[PDB]
Design an enzyme around this catalytic site. Structure first.
Site, PDB file in Angstrom:
ATOM      1  N   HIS A 118       0.817  -1.201   0.000  1.00  0.00           N
ATOM      2  CA  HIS A 118       0.000   0.000   0.000  1.00  0.00           C
ATOM      3  C   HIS A 118       0.854   1.255   0.000  1.00  0.00           C
TER       4      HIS A 118
ATOM      5  N   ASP B  93       7.750  20.865 -28.104  1.00  0.00           N
ATOM      6  CA  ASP B  93       7.721  19.624 -27.344  1.00  0.00           C
ATOM      7  C   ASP B  93       8.811  19.681 -26.280  1.00  0.00           C
TER       8      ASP B  93
ATOM      9  N   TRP C 176       7.727  -0.052   4.419  1.00  0.00           N
ATOM     10  CA  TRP C 176       8.120   0.823   3.322  1.00  0.00           C
ATOM     11  C   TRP C 176       9.610   1.125   3.386  1.00  0.00           C
TER      12      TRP C 176
ATOM     13  N   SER D 160      13.383   6.314 -14.159  1.00  0.00           N
ATOM     14  CA  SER D 160      12.364   7.133 -14.806  1.00  0.00           C
ATOM     15  C   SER D 160      12.345   8.549 -14.241  1.00  0.00           C
ATOM     16  N   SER D 161      12.399   8.676 -12.914  1.00  0.00           N
ATOM     17  CA  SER D 161      12.357   9.995 -12.293  1.00  0.00           C
ATOM     18  C   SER D 161      13.579  10.823 -12.665  1.00  0.00           C
TER      19      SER D 161
ATOM     20  N   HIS E 112      13.526  12.332   3.292  1.00  0.00           N
ATOM     21  CA  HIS E 112      12.826  13.580   3.546  1.00  0.00           C
ATOM     22  C   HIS E 112      12.616  14.448   2.314  1.00  0.00           C
TER      23      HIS E 112
ATOM     24  N   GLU F  73      11.847  13.484  -0.513  1.00  0.00           N
ATOM     25  CA  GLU F  73      10.732  12.888  -1.235  1.00  0.00           C
ATOM     26  C   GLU F  73       9.402  13.489  -0.802  1.00  0.00           C
TER      27      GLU F  73
ATOM     28  N   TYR G 154       8.784  16.333   0.113  1.00  0.00           N
ATOM     29  CA  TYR G 154       8.599  17.640  -0.494  1.00  0.00           C
ATOM     30  C   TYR G 154       8.392  17.541  -1.993  1.00  0.00           C
TER      31      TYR G 154
ATOM     32  N   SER H  25      -2.173  27.756  -6.667  1.00  0.00           N
ATOM     33  CA  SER H  25      -2.021  29.176  -6.957  1.00  0.00           C
ATOM     34  C   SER H  25      -2.869  29.561  -8.152  1.00  0.00           C
TER      35      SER H  25
ATOM     36  N   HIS I 245      15.671  13.713  12.072  1.00  0.00           N
ATOM     37  CA  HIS I 245      14.541  13.711  12.990  1.00  0.00           C
ATOM     38  C   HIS I 245      13.711  12.451  12.852  1.00  0.00           C
ATOM     39  N   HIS I 246      13.976  11.651  11.827  1.00  0.00           N
ATOM     40  CA  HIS I 246      13.389  10.330  11.725  1.00  0.00           C
ATOM     41  C   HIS I 246      14.023   9.343  12.686  1.00  0.00           C
TER      42      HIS I 246
ATOM     43  N   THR J 273       6.623  28.267   4.526  1.00  0.00           N
ATOM     44  CA  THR J 273       5.268  27.766   4.350  1.00  0.00           C
ATOM     45  C   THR J 273       4.243  28.721   4.936  1.00  0.00           C
TER      46      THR J 273
ATOM     47  N   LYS K  34       3.701  31.405   2.489  1.00  0.00           N
ATOM     48  CA  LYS K  34       2.848  30.975   1.387  1.00  0.00           C
ATOM     49  C   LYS K  34       1.376  30.956   1.783  1.00  0.00           C
TER      50      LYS K  34
ATOM     51  N   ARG L  84       2.818   1.276  16.018  1.00  0.00           N
ATOM     52  CA  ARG L  84       2.585   1.119  14.591  1.00  0.00           C
ATOM     53  C   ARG L  84       2.840  -0.313  14.146  1.00  0.00           C
TER      54      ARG L  84
HETATM   55  C1  HEA Z   1       3.946  14.824   2.244  1.00  0.00           C
HETATM   56  C2  HEA Z   1       3.541  15.453   3.339  1.00  0.00           C
HETATM   57  C3  HEA Z   1       4.557  15.850   4.315  1.00  0.00           C
HETATM   58  C4  HEA Z   1       5.125  17.106   4.413  1.00  0.00           C
HETATM   59  C5  HEA Z   1       4.803  18.296   3.555  1.00  0.00           C
HETATM   60  C6  HEA Z   1       6.043  17.077   5.431  1.00  0.00           C
HETATM   61  C7  HEA Z   1       6.860  18.039   5.949  1.00  0.00           C
HETATM   62  C8  HEA Z   1       6.942  18.205   7.310  1.00  0.00           C
HETATM   63  N1  HEA Z   1       7.020  17.120   8.126  1.00  0.00           N
HETATM   64 FE1  HEA Z   1       7.213  15.334   7.454  1.00  0.00          FE
HETATM   65  N2  HEA Z   1       6.678  13.514   7.207  1.00  0.00           N
HETATM   66  C9  HEA Z   1       5.763  12.961   6.370  1.00  0.00           C
HETATM   67  C10 HEA Z   1       4.913  13.729   5.604  1.00  0.00           C
HETATM   68  C11 HEA Z   1       5.134  15.035   5.296  1.00  0.00           C
HETATM   69  N3  HEA Z   1       6.037  15.815   6.015  1.00  0.00           N
HETATM   70  C12 HEA Z   1       5.811  11.510   6.476  1.00  0.00           C
HETATM   71  C13 HEA Z   1       4.962  10.513   5.754  1.00  0.00           C
HETATM   72  C14 HEA Z   1       6.796  11.210   7.346  1.00  0.00           C
HETATM   73  C15 HEA Z   1       7.315   9.874   7.817  1.00  0.00           C
HETATM   74  C16 HEA Z   1       6.243   8.910   8.298  1.00  0.00           C
HETATM   75  C17 HEA Z   1       6.911   7.573   8.479  1.00  0.00           C
HETATM   76  O1  HEA Z   1       8.108   7.495   8.395  1.00  0.00           O
HETATM   77  O2  HEA Z   1       6.232   6.551   9.021  1.00  0.00           O
HETATM   78  C18 HEA Z   1       7.353  12.474   7.738  1.00  0.00           C
HETATM   79  C19 HEA Z   1       8.382  12.673   8.609  1.00  0.00           C
HETATM   80  C20 HEA Z   1       8.254  13.600   9.570  1.00  0.00           C
HETATM   81  C21 HEA Z   1       8.541  13.537  10.907  1.00  0.00           C
HETATM   82  C22 HEA Z   1       9.123  12.364  11.651  1.00  0.00           C
HETATM   83  C23 HEA Z   1       8.155  11.903  12.735  1.00  0.00           C
HETATM   84  C24 HEA Z   1       8.693  10.671  13.403  1.00  0.00           C
HETATM   85  O3  HEA Z   1       9.447  10.771  14.334  1.00  0.00           O
HETATM   86  O4  HEA Z   1       8.252   9.465  13.030  1.00  0.00           O
HETATM   87  C25 HEA Z   1       8.217  14.763  11.434  1.00  0.00           C
HETATM   88  C26 HEA Z   1       8.372  15.158  12.819  1.00  0.00           C
HETATM   89  O5  HEA Z   1       9.255  14.663  13.486  1.00  0.00           O
HETATM   90  C27 HEA Z   1       7.707  15.563  10.410  1.00  0.00           C
HETATM   91  C28 HEA Z   1       7.256  16.832  10.477  1.00  0.00           C
HETATM   92  C29 HEA Z   1       7.112  17.618   9.377  1.00  0.00           C
HETATM   93  C30 HEA Z   1       6.994  19.056   9.370  1.00  0.00           C
HETATM   94  C31 HEA Z   1       6.991  19.962  10.569  1.00  0.00           C
HETATM   95  C32 HEA Z   1       6.875  19.432   8.086  1.00  0.00           C
HETATM   96  C33 HEA Z   1       6.722  20.857   7.623  1.00  0.00           C
HETATM   97  O6  HEA Z   1       7.055  20.988   6.241  1.00  0.00           O
HETATM   98  C34 HEA Z   1       5.287  21.320   7.836  1.00  0.00           C
HETATM   99  C35 HEA Z   1       5.303  22.815   8.135  1.00  0.00           C
HETATM  100  C36 HEA Z   1       3.900  23.354   8.075  1.00  0.00           C
HETATM  101  C37 HEA Z   1       3.553  24.331   8.864  1.00  0.00           C
HETATM  102  C38 HEA Z   1       4.514  24.817   9.914  1.00  0.00           C
HETATM  103  C39 HEA Z   1       2.316  25.131   8.575  1.00  0.00           C
HETATM  104  C40 HEA Z   1       2.601  26.592   8.909  1.00  0.00           C
HETATM  105  C41 HEA Z   1       1.333  27.395   8.877  1.00  0.00           C
HETATM  106  C42 HEA Z   1       1.378  28.624   9.306  1.00  0.00           C
HETATM  107  C43 HEA Z   1       0.100  29.334   9.665  1.00  0.00           C
HETATM  108  C44 HEA Z   1       2.696  29.156   9.792  1.00  0.00           C
HETATM  109  C45 HEA Z   1       2.589  29.491  11.275  1.00  0.00           C
HETATM  110  C46 HEA Z   1       3.945  29.409  11.919  1.00  0.00           C
HETATM  111  C47 HEA Z   1       4.142  28.589  12.919  1.00  0.00           C
HETATM  112  C48 HEA Z   1       3.268  27.371  13.069  1.00  0.00           C
HETATM  113  C49 HEA Z   1       5.029  28.996  14.060  1.00  0.00           C
HETATM  114  N4  HEA Z   1       7.697  14.833   9.234  1.00  0.00           N
HETATM  115 CU   LIG Z   2      11.700  13.866   7.858  1.00  0.00          CU
END
Ligand code: HEA
Ligand SMILES: [Cu+2]
Ligand SMILES: CCCCCCCCCCCCCCCCCCCC(=O)O[C@H](COC(=O)CCCCCCCCCCCCCC)COP(=O)(O)OCCN
Ligand SMILES: NCCc1c[nH]c2ccc(O)cc12
Ligand code: CUA
Ligand SMILES: [Zn+2]
Lengths: 236, 48, 268, 124, 117, 363, 56, 100, 535, 58
Positions: free
Chosen positions: I64, I94, I129, I159-160, I243, I245, I247, I258, I292-293, I318, I321, I440
């Protein structure tokens, strides 16, 4: 402690470390709630006023002061949050005089416990193995998938240092109430510490995936008084 | 022959068998493949 | 755009490629290679003559790509100042992707170098593992690679000044001087007394050195093709994009070797 | 008068060759000084240009929100029924019983567990 | 495949761009081996004519209906991008002038006309 | 603190080239004032103490950078450049001195100083301008300023809130007497001169023959920037094991070889590799010669290490002071390839002088 | 007079930013003075009877 | 950055040179797209611009735009008590009086 | 023979996007049904569907994840919306390398066969995974199954990489007459940045995974502790790719939004240059934070501070944005078409999903949230409710322009509300389960965690019914799509302004800020013969 | 004729009315062997990936 049926929040703490974690979490949730309410209110305003509006302001596109302010405010929020996290990180640890050492080897699908002290001249170190009681053999009232046949026993109000290692795969030693979560790698020794403030039973489970029987390797700790600890140790 | 039905890899109108059959078989196969694997690996380990 | 009969030619300087069958065939060849290799190593096949056929099919597919890529530039004449620039940019971006794989192996070497495990005695190359002396054949290879890098610049300057005999000789000498590197490093795997599975030193020494071997076989193939395509009058004095693409590769390989000689042989 | 009176109810059904005729008859009649125009002409001139027809119709009408609401309700009832059917036929282990989740309470009360908010394993 | 062109005035297609051959024993030049849309550019760059122009559209005066801005095209339509008279004031708007209508640029007001060649 | 001084030296090196590169003669003036002010700071370090010169450099950078942004007048810009030079010497000299001070062991000094001196390339890469004309350009440096402050919070909390006999000696004349001390300094100069001579002139020649636009001129120097960090980080470790004198001699050799190889290239692709070689060689020589000077002074003198680093800073900044414009002036008569040829041959001839530092003379 | 209006969107912006922040503090100062502090007081008062019982 | 008295001159001169209906509607579209409400003189020029191009719906929809641009009702009543000669001279009737 | 030369031996860049779309639909259906299989076993305590076999539960989870990160989001966001929309927006005929586009497509169908065959030849590949070494060795997984799942991550990587090279090279030298590289729309900037991340991040994963393969089948002892190796090395080599990925999956979404927010709120975006700078910063800071993972593996006390400091800093771009999106939405006129509903839903769901990341960036608190459904609830709001919503919005935005056939408004609205309700009922209770301590990757749980898991198996059945309704919506778009443009004025790209009459609107109907909506109803096979001009 | 058939081939490769990979009278050699062997390779990998799902070994 034991999980409760419809849980919403943390389990009851029995170590200063878990108290610190709870305080820090509740300190961060403040600012997160503030930001969420702000964004939600702005979206509500946009829906309420500017839905099918006759006048369109297509010349408010630059700004110069408002972009200073949505770049500086989150920074001060981050610094305010980061101060207490650094204090909690650097302060809380085994600063002075660890008083007891327990080695917890994680084999494939059960745990092995050695008490590093309490050795005679011939090598009679107290040691045992903790398994999981199957469902078919449970007694009346024993929790399912959390109750072990032999349980770790410790005194209250004494530092306990857990040294964690592994023999087969990468495991994880966890007990949520005591605030302990460390890994068990195949070729290194990790260490965590805990101080228990009240007597009771504390349950936990493994974390890192290891295969078929990942869902059954529970951890169980009892905190008996010093006298009951001496009686228990004078029998094993 | 540029037009609104010309850039798609499949035919949609003026077709012997109606398009609903190919459209439904696509999703049926896609959503039924993951059950075949579970059946195969359940029948291989004794359990039903 | 007011030249007289301008509609009889294309209005933009870009190449609209004709329909070609090579992508699908290369995809099928890689699919067969992957399945066959995944099966043969665990039983299920027995004979080894299918893996080799898969490898040969992959290589033949790449060669048949390159046939069209040469015909579309030397016979049809669709390579303007724009398309050439695009090809150069793409080759640089591919070479960067190859470079960032050696970084992973270097990081793997430095992660085990600083912090050796308790199981091995705390010492680099451990007891019972005799390393390769860097005052031997490892020193011939550096000299031969530098001489090769210096001999290909005489070939690119012998085409700018309109010399024919003077570009063939340089390219031939470069090919014959890189084959000597490959031969020396293929008679050095038979004079070592430590294998792939004796320690972590012997698993990473060979991983980094091994990748260099294949990347040098690619250079031998490329230089042979450059000689063969110059002998038949394909290269003009100001439109030659095989020589530059093959010269940028050799220099990067030399720079990488001078890191594989400072971190793998002396240090220990 | 009949051509222009009451365009608000007939105008959208006419073809595209009887529309340009009215537009062309309202163009050589507006060049004259105003106040010489009948009221129906003024209303029709307002309706032809800025009115609720054609590209100014709403995205949702009053009868479409009802369709959407009753579609969402129907889509939720199906899921509820299917989950109920998959819920009745369950493997309920021996621990999920009221007489069993009371003995665990006695065990957890002898050893004081959750002195704060609370302990109770009863969910029947 | 036919007579070889000497300047960009006798090139009526892809048939006048083959050229003579180099002589045995010398590195051939670009003027003795160049075939398609490459020799066309080579011939253009030797007398001063740019075959592939890169001059952005005129941004000097606005455009009315009586005197519109004329845009050359070998098709019935062409895509045009408008940004204003001082050339960066109006935000970007895109228009499609054709041979039966003129584009008008809803914001600033310039009118563009299509000139068929 | 150890981590605190690591962060302090890293940011001190990082901000300097950040201020340097942004642009709206002056460079020579700033480098000259930096050369002049250095020995005074070295003397001050003995009596006043290390943290004060570090603290002064920060405010000096703030005043200099404010002058750049808010002032278009020539005099204010000149004052900003002069304070930039003077102040940096404070920051660099005090930072290097205390970095040596906390890191007592001979082996750790090389790795720590390599980590520190990697900050110069980070400064150039991070922002070509820093705090430049348009607001969105402080929409990029804002995220990194926050990170710098946040890490400084770690350092301060470690030193202050919670758990983390000076000797008058080595007079400057006594420092000058040691020829051994001199050797490294001299080499240090040579390398600096080389990049410097290269900086103004190389773009100019490219304009003449390459037929390359300004973007190629800018992008030519990125490989050198990456090479400096890579080489410094690797050889800060490798120098101790392979012998610091051998690393110095080899690095001078690659400096000369790359400088000769540079002119022959007639395309950007030929231009790419020699820049990488130059970067690796210069990083090698810098990382080899920086730690060794403190070791030499400790063996043959008392452990008061402030002025030695003043002499080192003089060696680094004298090249940027004079030589960049001089290299171009030599060109157009000596020509493009002859300048690099002479620089490389000088490097090769001067390389054997590194042998003397192989075995530290008894003392 | 009444026929000279100059700036009205700016005032709306200020009033919307000045209502979305007071509401936020209202909803977040209830988190820290009605859901957090009472729990801490309850926990501490539980720990300060268990030592008196042991003392007796 | 513009002042009120520069806005109310730029748009008057621009309304004095619209030559088709497209242009009058274009200039009217982005006059009501700023933070400043048009002064009575600007609307007075707009009505004459509509009268030259011979359109009636635009002259009625101009007064309907003011009902949405103005903040309150006293201001709307103040506008109609100054553009009263123009309405009764050209012949414009408001939408509230038509009930279309 | 015309068929094969036009859909199998392809050179046109707009004919590979449709193949990518048809492939992504299949590979998303597979993943969603595997999710349904998992979510039925975690319904009440015991062993319900999968009789007792705990293998074949981890297999479903791994499949999955793999089918629905590598086979749905990436092909849909870079294969469909990149290849089709980038050349039209920048003005190119193209792609520069067409045959590479064809191979970048055709390497995928072979890569699905490997993953499907890694689940049928033996017990399977239940390694997660993230394939950690000593469990994905030869002592626990002994068969051609981990090996075949490693080979599906090689072909996808090829491919990527090829697509990234093609995008960077086509956007550098292949633009129109007056488009400098600061007038590009935001979508092209997003594609460029994600391609740069792909170039700098994929070789590390290739090296780590190939080292694992060699260790399995050639006894090389890279990650074996009995020869001097450390498993932790693998973790490093994975998360340097891991990480970036997350993004790469989200940056293509942002740009799409946008465009929507600039169309249905008739106002240009607030600070476009600020947007491009913010995307640059988010991309750059996404390479410097990878550990941080792994906080519970035993890191030092001084490296924890760096990783808590360098993870929080991403909030600033972010936040810029999000605030700029609100600013561009503020003063304008808003019309609630079906793309705009998803645009509104994205703005709130992503914020809620990312606010949880700041609670997990701290090292001190991650001792309570690691390996728990808190992390799962965190990342499904940002993946399922942030990226999937963007894909649905992009489909509903450009489907008429590509196919020339319109869709029913009411059914689309029904699907939107169903998916919103289902995804909110399915991923929210995981926060409570995580705080109370559920780990988990476990098929069976203690009896305490029963109740909430009864609620989360109820939302899956709403989301899947939404998917079936989406299937019907496509069917009714294809058939009788020509008569569907008169049911609702949703069909209009932009409604008339206040003072613009309907007659004038009908002659000049399309007003856009990009080329996309000036092209013909299906864009012509050769769309630009004479070059476009800007000023 | 001489070594420069570069000019003659050019007139051949333009308007050959057959795809440029099969226009020469030597194309046959490259492709009658290649296409045929790919079929054998592809049919020999699908006979073993179905013969492995059923547990039959060699
Ligand atoms: C694709 C979606 C996505 C995105 C965009 C991101 C980006 C970010 N991820 Fe990532 N992340 C995942 C999906 C994603 N992640 C997944 C799947 C994992 C691993 C799961 C696994 O391994 O099992 C992971 C991994 C992961 C972990 C590891 C957790 C662990 O220990 O297992 C953590 C935290 O530790 C984290 C946090 C964050 C943060 C803070 C962002 C930041 O980019 C987000 C920031 C967003 C905001 C901050 C919004 C701000 C809004 C405003 C209004 C600003 C206000 C200002 C403040 C809040 C002060 N992510
Ligand atoms: Cu991460
Ligand atoms: C990794 C696996 C893939 C490796 C293969 C990569 C191939 C890169 C080739 C780059 C081609 C660039 C290019 O445009 O070259 C054209 C022809 O080149 C060429 O034809 C060069 C062909 C090189 C083939 C190398 C194959 C090695 C395969 C490994 C075998 C073991 C130009 O031609 P031109 O414009 O200069 O001529 C003009 C005179 N009119
Ligand atoms: N010692 C500094 C040498 C150096 C290498 N690369 C550089 C880049 C910029 C600079 O100012 C200097 C350098
Ligand atoms: Cu075993 Cu976890
Ligand atoms: Zn305009």
């Amino acid at each position: 402690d034991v999980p409760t049926p419809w849980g919403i929040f943390f389990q009851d703490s029995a170590t200063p470390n878990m108290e610190g974690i709870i305080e820090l979490h509740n300190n961060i949730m403040f600012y997160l709630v503030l930001i969420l309410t702000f964004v939600s209110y702005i979206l509500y305003t946009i829906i309420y006023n500017y839905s099918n509006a006759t006048i369109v302001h297509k010349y408010m596109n630059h700004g110069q002061l408002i972009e200073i302010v949505w770049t500086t405010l989150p920074a001060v929020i981050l610094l305010i949050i980061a101060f207490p996290s650094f204090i909690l990180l650097y302060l809380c640890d085994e600063v002075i005089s660890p008083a007891m050492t327990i080695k917890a080897i994680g084999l494939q699908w059960y745990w092995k416990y050695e008490y590093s002290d309490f050795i005679n001249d011939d090598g009679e170190i107290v040691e045992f193995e903790s398994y999981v009681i199957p469902e078919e053999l449970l007694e009346d009232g024993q929790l399912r998938l959390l109750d072990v046949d032999a349980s770790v026993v410790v005194p209250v109000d004494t530092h306990i240092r857990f040294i964690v290692s592994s023999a087969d795969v990468i495991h994880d030693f966890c007990v949520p109430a005591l605030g302990v979560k460390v890994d068990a790698s195949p070729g290194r020794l990790n260490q965590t510490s805990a101080l228990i403030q009240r007597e009771g039973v504390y349950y936990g489970q493994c974390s890192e995936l290891c295969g078929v029987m990942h869902s059954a390797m529970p951890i169980k700790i009892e905190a008996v008084s010093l006298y009951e600890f001496i009686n228990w140790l004078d029998e094993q | 022959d540029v037009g609104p039905y010309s850039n798609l890899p499949f035919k949609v109108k003026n077709r012997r068998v109606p398009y609903a059959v190919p459209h439904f078989l696509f999703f049926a196969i896609g959503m039924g493949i993951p059950f075949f694997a579970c059946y195969v690996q359940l029948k291989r380990s004794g359990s039903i | 755009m007011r030249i007289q009969n301008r509609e009889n030619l294309q209005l933009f300087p870009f190449h609209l490629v004709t329909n070609s069958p090579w992508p699908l065939t290369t995809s099928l060849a890689l699919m067969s290679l992957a399945l066959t290799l995944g099966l043969t190593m665990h039983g299920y096949i027995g004979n080894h003559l299918w893996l080799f056929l898969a490898i040969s099919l992959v290589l033949s597919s790449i060669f048949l790509w390159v046939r069209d890529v040469v015909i579309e530039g030397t016979y049809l004449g669709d390579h303007t100042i724009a398309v050439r620039k695009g090809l150069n940019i793409g080759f640089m971006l591919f070479v960067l992707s190859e470079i960032l794989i050696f970084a992973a192996l270097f990081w793997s070497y430095f992660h085990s170098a600083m912090g050796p495990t308790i199981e091995i005695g705390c010492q680099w190359p451990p007891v019972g593992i005799t390393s390769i002396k860097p005052t031997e054949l490892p020193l011939l290879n550096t000299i031969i690679l530098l001489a090769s890098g210096a001999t290909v610049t005489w070939a690119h300057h012998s085409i700018l000044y309109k010399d024919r005999q003077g570009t063939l000789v340089g390219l031939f000498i470069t090919t014959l001087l890189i084959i000597l590197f490959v031969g020396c490093q293929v008679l050095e795997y038979t004079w070592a007394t430590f294998t792939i599975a004796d320690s972590v030193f012997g698993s990473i020494f060979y991983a980094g050195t091994g990748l260099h071997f294949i990347h040098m076989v690619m250079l031998i193939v490329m230089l042979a093709i450059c000689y063969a395509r110059m002998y038949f009058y394909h290269f003009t004095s100001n439109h030659h994009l095989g020589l530059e693409t093959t010269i940028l590769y050799l220099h990067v390989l030399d720079i990488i070797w001078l890191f594989l000689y400072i971190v793998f042989y002396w240090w220990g | 008068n009949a051509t222009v009176t009451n365009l608000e109810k007939r105008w959208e059904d006419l073809p595209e060759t009887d529309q340009k005729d009215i537009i062309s008859q309202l163009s050589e009649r507006q060049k004259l000084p105003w106040k010489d125009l009948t009221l129906s002409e003024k209303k029709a001139a307002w309706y032809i240009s800025f009115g609720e027809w054609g590209p100014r119709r709403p995205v949702h009408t009053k009868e479409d929100k009802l369709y959407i609401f009753w579609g969402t309700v129907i889509g939720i009832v199906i899921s509820a029924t299917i989950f109920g059917a998959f819920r009745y036929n369950r493997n309920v282990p021996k621990t999920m019983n009221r007489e069993w989740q009371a003995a665990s309470d006695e065990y957890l009360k002898s050893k004081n567990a959750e002195p704060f908010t609370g302990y109770s394993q009863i969910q029947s | 495949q036919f007579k070889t062109a000497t300047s960009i005035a006798e090139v009526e297609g892809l048939e006048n761009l083959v050229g003579p051959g180099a002589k045995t024993g010398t590195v051939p030049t670009d003027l003795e081996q160049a075939t398609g849309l490459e020799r066309y550019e080579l011939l253009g760059k030797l007398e001063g004519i740019e075959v592939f122009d890169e001059t952005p559209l005129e941004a000097v005066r606005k455009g009315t209906m009586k005197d519109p801005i004329l845009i050359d095209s070998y098709d019935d339509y062409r895509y045009v991008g408008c940004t204003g008279v001082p050339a960066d004031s109006h935000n970007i708007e895109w228009l499609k002038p054709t041979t039966e209508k003129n584009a008008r640029c809803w914001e600033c007001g310039s009118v563009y006309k299509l000139n068929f060649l | 603190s150890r981590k605190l001084i690591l962060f302090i030296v890293f940011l001190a090196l990082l901000l300097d080239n950040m201020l340097l590169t942004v642009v709206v003669l002056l460079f020579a003036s700033k480098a000259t004032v930096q050369l002049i002010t250095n020995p005074f700071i070295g003397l001050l370090t003995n009596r006043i103490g290390y943290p004060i010169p570090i603290f002064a450099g920060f405010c000096i950078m703030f005043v200099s950078t404010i002058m750049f942004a808010f002032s278009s007048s020539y005099a204010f810009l000149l004052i900003a450049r002069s304070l930039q030079g003077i102040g940096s010497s404070c920051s660099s000299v005090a930072g290097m001195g205390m970095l040596a001070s906390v890191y007592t062991d001979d082996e750790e000094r090389g790795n720590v100083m390599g980590i520190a001196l990697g900050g110069l390339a980070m400064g150039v890469l991070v922002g070509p301008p820093f705090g430049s004309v348009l607001y969105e350009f402080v929409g990029k440096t804002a995220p990194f300023l926050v990170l710098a402050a946040l890490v400084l919070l770690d350092g301060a909390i470690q030193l202050f809130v919670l758990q983390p006999e000076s000797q008058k000696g080595t007079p400057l004349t006594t420092l000058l007497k040691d020829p051994y001390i001199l050797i490294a300094a001299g080499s240090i100069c040579f390398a600096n001169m080389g990049i410097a001579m290269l900086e103004p002139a190389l773009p100019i020649w490219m304009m003449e023959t390459m037929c390359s636009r300004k973007w190629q001129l800018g992008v030519a120097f990125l490989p050198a920037s990456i090479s400096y960090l890579i080489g410094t980080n690797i050889f800060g470790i490798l120098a101790h094991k392979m012998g610091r004198w051998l690393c110095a001699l080899l690095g001078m050799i690659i400096v000369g070889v790359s400088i000769l190889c540079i002119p022959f290239a007639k395309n950007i692709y030929g231009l790419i590799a020699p820049n990488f070689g130059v970067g690796f060689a210069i990083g090698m020589v810098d990382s080899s010669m920086m730690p060794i000077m403190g070791y030499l002074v400790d063996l043959r003198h008392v452990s008061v290490y402030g002025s030695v680093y003043a002499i080192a800073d003089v060696a680094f900044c004298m090249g940027y002071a004079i030589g960049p414009s001089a290299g171009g002036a030599i060109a157009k008569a000596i020509g493009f390839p002859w300048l690099m040829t002479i620089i490389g041959i000088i490097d090769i001839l001067f390389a054997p002088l590194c042998f003397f530092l192989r075995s530290p003379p008894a003392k | 007079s009444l026929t000279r209006i100059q700036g009205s969107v700016k005032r709306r912006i200020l009033t919307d930013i000045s209502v979305g922040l007071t509401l936020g503090f209202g909803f977040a100062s209830y988190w820290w003075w009605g859901v957090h502090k009472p729990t801490v007081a309850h926990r501490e008062n539980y720990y300060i009877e268990l030592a008196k019982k042991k003392k007796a | 950055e513009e002042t009120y008295e520069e806005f109310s001159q730029r748009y008057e001169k621009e309304f004095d040179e619209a030559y088709d209906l497209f242009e009058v509607q274009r200039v009217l579209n982005n006059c009501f797209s700023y933070d400043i409400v048009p002064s009575p003189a600007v609307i007075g020029k707009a009505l004459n611009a509509c009268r030259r191009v011979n359109d009636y719906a635009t002259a009625v929809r101009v007064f309907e735009g003011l009902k949405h641009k103005v903040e309150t009702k006293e201001q709307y009543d103040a506008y109609l008590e100054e553009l009263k000669d123009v309405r009764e001279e050209l012949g414009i009737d408001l939408k509230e009086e038509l009930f279309p | 023979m015309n068929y094969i030369n036009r859909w199998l031996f392809s050179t046109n860049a707009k004919d590979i996007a449709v193949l990518y779309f048809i492939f992504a639909l299949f590979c998303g259906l597979l993943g969603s049904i595997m999710s349904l299989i998992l979510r039925l076993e975690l319904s009440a305590p015991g062993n319900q569907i999968l009789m007792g076999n705990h293998q074949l539960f981890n297999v479903v989870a791994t499949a999955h994840a793999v089918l629905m990160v590598f086979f749905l989001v990436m092909p849909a966001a870079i294969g469909f919306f990149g290849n089709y929309l980038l050349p039209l927006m920048i003005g190119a005929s193209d792609m520069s390398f067409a045959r590479l586009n064809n191979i970048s497509f055709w390497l995928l169908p072979p890569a699905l066969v490997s993953l499907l065959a890694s689940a049928l030849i033996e017990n399977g590949a239940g390694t997660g995974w993230t394939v950690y070494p000593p469990l994905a060795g030869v002592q626990s997984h002994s068969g051609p199954s981990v090996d075949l799942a490693i080979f599906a991550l090689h072909l996808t990587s090829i491919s990527s990489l090829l697509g990234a090279i093609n995008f960077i090279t086509t956007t550098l030298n292949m633009r129109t007459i007056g488009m400098t590289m600061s007038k590009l729309p935001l979508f092209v900037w997003a594609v460029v940045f994600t391609s740069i991340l792909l170039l700098l991040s994929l070789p590390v994963l290739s090296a780590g995974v190939t080292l694992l393969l060699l260790d399995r089948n050639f006894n090389t002892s890279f990650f074996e502790p009995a020869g001097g190796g450390d498993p932790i090395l693998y973790q490093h080599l994975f998360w340097f790719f891991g990480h970036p990925e997350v993004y790469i999956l989200i940056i293509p979404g942002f740009g799409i939004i946008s465009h929507i927010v600039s169309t249905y709120s008739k106002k240009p975006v607030f600070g476009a240059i600020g947007m491009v700078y913010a995307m640059g910063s988010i991309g750059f800071l996404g390479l410097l934070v990878w550990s941080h993972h792994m906080y519970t593996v035993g890191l030092d006390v001084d490296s924890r501070a760096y990783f808590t400091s360098a993870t929080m800093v991403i909030a600033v771009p972010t936040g810029i944005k999000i605030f700029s999106w609100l600013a561009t939405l503020y003063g304008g006129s808003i019309r609630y078409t079906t793309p705009m509903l998803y645009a509104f839903a994205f703005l709130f769901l992503f914020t809620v999903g990312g606010l949880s990341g700041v609670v997990l960036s701290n090292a001190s608190l991650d001792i309570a949230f690691h390996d728990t459904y808190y992390v799962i609830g965190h990342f499904h709001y940002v993946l399922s409710l942030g990226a999937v919503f963007s894909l649905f919005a992009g489909y509903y935005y450009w489907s008429p322009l590509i196919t020339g056939l319109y869709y029913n408004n009411n059914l689309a609205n029904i699907q939107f509300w169903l998916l919103f309700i289902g995804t909110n009922v399915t991923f929210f209770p995981m926060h409570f389960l995580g705080l109370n301590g559920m780990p988990r990757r476990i098929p069976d749980y203690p009896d305490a965690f029963a109740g909430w898991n009864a609620i989360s198996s109820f939302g899956s059945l709403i989301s899947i019914i939404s998917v079936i309704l989406f299937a019907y919506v496509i069917y009714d778009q294809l058939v009788n799509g020509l008569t569907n443009k008169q049911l609702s004025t949703n069909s209009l790209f932009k409604n008339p302004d206040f003072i613009e009459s309907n007659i004038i609107f009908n002659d000049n109907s399309i007003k856009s800020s990009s080329i996309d909506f000036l092209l013909t109803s299906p864009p012509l096979p050769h769309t630009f013969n004479t070059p476009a001009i800007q000023s | 004729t001489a070594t420069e058939k570069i000019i003659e081939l050019q007139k051949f490769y333009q308007s050959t009315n057959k795809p440029i990979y099969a226009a020469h009278p030597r194309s046959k050699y490259y492709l009658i062997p290649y296409f045929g062997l790919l079929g054998v390779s592809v049919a020999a990998t699908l006979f073993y990936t179905g013969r492995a799902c059923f547990g039959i070994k060699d």
